[PDB]
Each structure stands twice: as C-alpha cells, then as structure tokens.
Design a protein around this motif. Structure first.
Motif, PDB file in Angstrom:
ATOM      1  N   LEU A 207       7.574  -1.664   2.251  1.00  0.00           N
ATOM      2  CA  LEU A 207       6.906  -1.672   0.812  1.00  0.00           C
ATOM      3  C   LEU A 207       5.147  -2.154   1.135  1.00  0.00           C
ATOM      4  CD1 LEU A 207       7.556  -0.880  -1.960  1.00  0.00           C
ATOM      5  CD2 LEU A 207       8.335  -3.051  -2.481  1.00  0.00           C
ATOM      6  N   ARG A 208       5.240  -3.110   2.073  1.00  0.00           N
ATOM      7  CA  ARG A 208       4.029  -3.442   2.373  1.00  0.00           C
ATOM      8  C   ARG A 208       3.122  -2.429   3.193  1.00  0.00           C
ATOM      9  NH1 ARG A 208       1.182  -9.377   4.106  1.00  0.00           N
ATOM     10  NH2 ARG A 208      -0.542  -8.672   5.297  1.00  0.00           N
ATOM     11  N   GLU A 209       3.879  -1.746   4.342  1.00  0.00           N
ATOM     12  CA  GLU A 209       3.523  -0.699   5.119  1.00  0.00           C
ATOM     13  C   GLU A 209       2.914   0.486   4.417  1.00  0.00           C
ATOM     14  OE1 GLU A 209       4.443  -0.163   9.131  1.00  0.00           O
ATOM     15  OE2 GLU A 209       6.302  -1.179   8.974  1.00  0.00           O
ATOM     16  N   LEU A 210       3.759   0.858   3.079  1.00  0.00           N
ATOM     17  CA  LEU A 210       3.371   1.783   2.715  1.00  0.00           C
ATOM     18  C   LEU A 210       2.520   1.678   1.163  1.00  0.00           C
ATOM     19  CD1 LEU A 210       3.940   5.008   2.147  1.00  0.00           C
ATOM     20  CD2 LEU A 210       6.160   4.525   1.159  1.00  0.00           C
ATOM     21  N   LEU A 211       2.526   0.671   0.729  1.00  0.00           N
ATOM     22  CA  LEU A 211       1.769   0.484  -0.692  1.00  0.00           C
ATOM     23  C   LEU A 211       0.071   0.830  -0.133  1.00  0.00           C
ATOM     24  CD1 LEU A 211       1.622  -1.312  -3.794  1.00  0.00           C
ATOM     25  CD2 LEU A 211       0.053  -2.061  -1.863  1.00  0.00           C
ATOM     26  N   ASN A 212      -0.321   0.100   0.951  1.00  0.00           N
ATOM     27  CA  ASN A 212      -1.768   0.269   1.546  1.00  0.00           C
ATOM     28  C   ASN A 212      -2.273   1.764   1.670  1.00  0.00           C
ATOM     29  OD1 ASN A 212      -2.713  -2.658   1.424  1.00  0.00           O
ATOM     30  ND2 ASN A 212      -0.611  -2.774   2.244  1.00  0.00           N
ATOM     31  N   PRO A 213      -1.381   2.623   2.330  1.00  0.00           N
ATOM     32  CA  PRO A 213      -1.911   3.994   2.259  1.00  0.00           C
ATOM     33  C   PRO A 213      -1.878   4.711   0.773  1.00  0.00           C
ATOM     34  CG  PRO A 213       0.104   3.915   3.437  1.00  0.00           C
ATOM     35  CD  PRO A 213      -0.426   2.365   3.249  1.00  0.00           C
ATOM     36  N   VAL A 214      -0.977   4.193  -0.136  1.00  0.00           N
ATOM     37  CA  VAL A 214      -1.095   4.450  -1.535  1.00  0.00           C
ATOM     38  C   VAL A 214      -2.407   4.110  -2.318  1.00  0.00           C
ATOM     39  CG1 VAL A 214       0.074   4.479  -3.667  1.00  0.00           C
ATOM     40  CG2 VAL A 214       1.527   4.992  -1.763  1.00  0.00           C
ATOM     41  N   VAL A 215      -2.677   2.749  -2.088  1.00  0.00           N
ATOM     42  CA  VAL A 215      -3.904   2.113  -2.766  1.00  0.00           C
ATOM     43  C   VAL A 215      -4.870   3.139  -2.469  1.00  0.00           C
ATOM     44  CG1 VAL A 215      -5.445   0.180  -2.433  1.00  0.00           C
ATOM     45  CG2 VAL A 215      -2.806  -0.072  -2.801  1.00  0.00           C
ATOM     46  N   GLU A 216      -5.136   3.895  -1.284  1.00  0.00           N
ATOM     47  CA  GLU A 216      -6.108   5.072  -1.009  1.00  0.00           C
ATOM     48  C   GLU A 216      -6.421   5.967  -2.257  1.00  0.00           C
ATOM     49  OE1 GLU A 216      -8.431   4.821   0.963  1.00  0.00           O
ATOM     50  OE2 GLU A 216      -7.105   5.215   2.944  1.00  0.00           O
ATOM     51  N   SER A 219      -9.554   6.683  -4.811  1.00  0.00           N
ATOM     52  CA  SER A 219     -10.617   7.586  -4.549  1.00  0.00           C
ATOM     53  C   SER A 219     -10.321   9.028  -5.475  1.00  0.00           C
ATOM     54  CB  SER A 219     -10.647   8.052  -2.920  1.00  0.00           C
ATOM     55  OG  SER A 219      -9.386   8.480  -2.557  1.00  0.00           O
ATOM     56  N   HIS A 220      -9.269   9.384  -5.816  1.00  0.00           N
ATOM     57  CA  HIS A 220      -8.888  10.794  -5.878  1.00  0.00           C
ATOM     58  C   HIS A 220      -9.304  11.526  -7.101  1.00  0.00           C
ATOM     59  CE1 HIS A 220      -6.883  14.748  -5.761  1.00  0.00           C
ATOM     60  NE2 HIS A 220      -7.199  14.372  -4.413  1.00  0.00           N
ATOM     61  N   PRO A 221      -9.838  12.730  -6.914  1.00  0.00           N
ATOM     62  CA  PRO A 221     -10.306  13.296  -8.288  1.00  0.00           C
ATOM     63  C   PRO A 221      -9.239  13.951  -9.184  1.00  0.00           C
ATOM     64  CG  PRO A 221     -10.715  14.950  -6.295  1.00  0.00           C
ATOM     65  CD  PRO A 221     -10.307  13.412  -5.939  1.00  0.00           C
ATOM     66  N   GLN A 264      -8.398  -2.799 -11.012  1.00  0.00           N
ATOM     67  CA  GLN A 264      -9.095  -1.518 -10.442  1.00  0.00           C
ATOM     68  C   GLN A 264      -8.968  -0.087 -11.254  1.00  0.00           C
ATOM     69  OE1 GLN A 264     -11.284  -1.744  -6.849  1.00  0.00           O
ATOM     70  NE2 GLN A 264      -9.641  -3.427  -6.318  1.00  0.00           N
ATOM     71  N   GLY A 265      -7.727  -0.071 -12.034  1.00  0.00           N
ATOM     72  CA  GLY A 265      -7.527   1.086 -12.792  1.00  0.00           C
ATOM     73  C   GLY A 265      -8.096   1.083 -14.352  1.00  0.00           C
ATOM     74  N   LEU A 266      -8.297  -0.109 -14.850  1.00  0.00           N
ATOM     75  CA  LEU A 266      -8.749  -0.196 -16.236  1.00  0.00           C
ATOM     76  C   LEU A 266     -10.071   0.292 -16.450  1.00  0.00           C
ATOM     77  CD1 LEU A 266      -7.246  -1.924 -18.575  1.00  0.00           C
ATOM     78  CD2 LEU A 266      -8.730  -3.831 -18.039  1.00  0.00           C
ATOM     79  N   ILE A 267     -10.897   0.471 -15.653  1.00  0.00           N
ATOM     80  CA  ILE A 267     -12.160   1.173 -15.632  1.00  0.00           C
ATOM     81  C   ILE A 267     -12.334   2.632 -15.670  1.00  0.00           C
ATOM     82  CG2 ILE A 267     -13.856  -0.819 -15.092  1.00  0.00           C
ATOM     83  CD1 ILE A 267     -13.776   0.559 -12.176  1.00  0.00           C
ATOM     84  N   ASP A 268     -11.336   3.252 -15.238  1.00  0.00           N
ATOM     85  CA  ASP A 268     -11.177   4.431 -14.601  1.00  0.00           C
ATOM     86  C   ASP A 268     -12.083   5.756 -15.241  1.00  0.00           C
ATOM     87  OD1 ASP A 268     -11.218   6.109 -12.424  1.00  0.00           O
ATOM     88  OD2 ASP A 268      -9.020   6.620 -13.151  1.00  0.00           O
ATOM     89  N   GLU A 269     -12.116   6.965 -14.525  1.00  0.00           N
ATOM     90  CA  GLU A 269     -13.047   8.069 -14.770  1.00  0.00           C
ATOM     91  C   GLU A 269     -12.222   9.220 -15.594  1.00  0.00           C
ATOM     92  OE1 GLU A 269     -14.882   9.301 -11.380  1.00  0.00           O
ATOM     93  OE2 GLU A 269     -16.021  10.708 -12.273  1.00  0.00           O
TER      94      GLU A 269
END
Length: 269
Positions: A207-216, A219-221, A264-269
């Motif tokens: 869950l630690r190993e995989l959450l971090n590449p999900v946090v990426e 960036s996503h449009p 970091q979701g609460l501001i989003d585009e």
C-alpha cells in the motif's frame, strides 16, 4: 409493447448459419440473437425446428471468420450473454455447456491469440466466469501487447479478478512500477480501475509502495482519470484515518500523506 411473442429458432438460425461467411452479412443472426437478449432477455431456450448444442456449436464458429474486424469478435458478445442468461435462467445444460465453452477457447486462443484474448474479454466482460481456467496464460500476454490489447488484457484480469497468483509476486515489478507511469488515458483509466478494487487484499507494505505512484496523478489533465485517483485516496483516508494506536505505522502515515494530498485536491482545476 405487450407480452413477448418468443420467436421461432428457424428465423434466428439461418441469419447466423446460412453461408459460413467470407463476408460481413452473417453478423445479422448475431445482432438478432442479441435482441432476444436485449429486451430483458425473453425466452430463447431452443425447441422448435432445431436442437440446442449444435445451434451453439455453429454459433461459436462465427468467431472463426477473422478476415473482418466486426465479424468474428461479435459472436463472443452474444455468447457471453448466453452465459449471463443460462446462468440466471439457470438452464440444466450448464455443466457440459461450460466444458464446451472452455474447449472452444482452448482450441483457439492456442492459435489465434489476439482474436481469442478479445474473445476471453467478450466472455469475462459480458459475463465474468470462464477465465479462471486460463488466468496464467492471460498475464502471459499483458507484457507482449501494448495499447488497446494492454487495456483489454487488463480488462480480462479485471472483470474476472479473484486475487490470482498472490498478486504482487506476479506483479510487484512486472506492471505497476512503470505501466502505471504509461501515458494513454484509457490505459491509465482501467489501470486505476484495477487499483480501486484490490484494496482489501493489500498489506500496508505494498500500500506504501503503490500509493506513491498513484499520487503522481495529481498532474493529470483527465478529470475522468483523476476522479479515480480521488476514489482511491478517499478509500485510503477512510480506512487509515487513525484508530487509537498502530503497530503498522504506514496505516496512519500513508494517511499522513493522504490527509494532505486530499487537501491538494481541494483547490483543483
């Protein structure tokens, strides 16, 4: 309209069985038989004019006509909803029938690999069951095919997920380190759609190993992709919001990240 007016199997027959095609046309009986699925699946259940298993054998032969992109694959849709139907109408053929379906996939995913991975996706997606016998031989091709077949090979594993191969000892490197990091919005979409159900079987280590590449995905449009990053993070948060105390420190410090990246979701585009 009123009642159901169940159709003679004579009509249905010729429309998928008249000429073994070199042509588009024979997907007419395929459309048709799909309609006695479509309308809450009225009685099909053949009796009049023709007999059951042969009717199906001819029907599975429709996915042999591989010269045309709309012809062969269509049969496996109709046939996948036969399993939904015969499963829930519960018809007594279902054992030797299922061995015939297994036999049909086993004759021809052996020789027509894309076309029958697409077939094991019309099976599996349209009703889940058949892939259980195969699954090793599906993970087998996920690193060999990129693109649409990345997504459909994933979508077989997804639609018929039963935790096969203790997953991280197949997968801990083999996809989620970098196929996760790979571009196409639909690939990324079905990819997070895998993540979002593997939840209950994750230990806090992966869950630690995989959450971090999900946090990426911050960036996503695609809001359509990013929402699922949030569906995920929300699940993390609600399950790893701090109880009284923990042995497994990540089971509040993945949360010490999530409880921030939700902000970091609460501001989003």
């Amino acid at each position: 309209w009123k009642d159901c007016l169940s159709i003679p199997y004579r009509l249905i027959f010729e429309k998928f069985s008249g000429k073994d095609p070199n042509s588009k046309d024979n997907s007419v009986g395929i459309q048709l038989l799909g309609i006695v699925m479509a309308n809450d699946l009225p009685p099909y259940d053949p009796q009049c004019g023709i007999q059951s298993s042969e009717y199906f054998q001819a029907l599975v032969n429709n996915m042999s006509f591989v010269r045309y992109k709309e012809v062969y694959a269509a049969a496996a849709e109709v046939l996948g909803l036969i399993l939904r139907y015969v499963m829930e109408r519960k018809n007594i053929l279902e054992e030797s029938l299922c061995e015939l379906v297994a036999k049909q996939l086993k004759q021809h995913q052996n020789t027509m690999e894309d076309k029958f991975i697409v077939c094991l996706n019309k099976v599996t997606k349209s009703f889940p069951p058949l892939a259980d016998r195969f699954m090793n031989a599906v993970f087998f091709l996920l690193p060999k095919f990129h693109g649409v077949l990345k997504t459909l090979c994933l979508e077989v594993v997804l639609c018929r997920v039963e935790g096969m191969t203790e997953l991280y000892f197949q997968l801990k490197s083999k996809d989620f380190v970098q196929v996760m990091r790979h571009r196409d919005d639909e690939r990324q979409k079905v990819c997070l759609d895998i993540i979002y159900k593997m939840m209950p079987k994750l230990k806090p280590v992966e869950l630690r190993e995989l959450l971090n590449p999900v946090v990426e995905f911050v960036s996503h449009p695609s809001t359509t992709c990013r929402e699922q990053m949030y569906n995920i993070l929300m699940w993390i948060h609600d399950n790893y919001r701090d109880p009284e105390s923990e042995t497994d420190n990540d089971s509040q410090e993945i949360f010490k990240l999530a409880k921030d990246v939700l902000i970091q979701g609460l501001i989003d585009e």
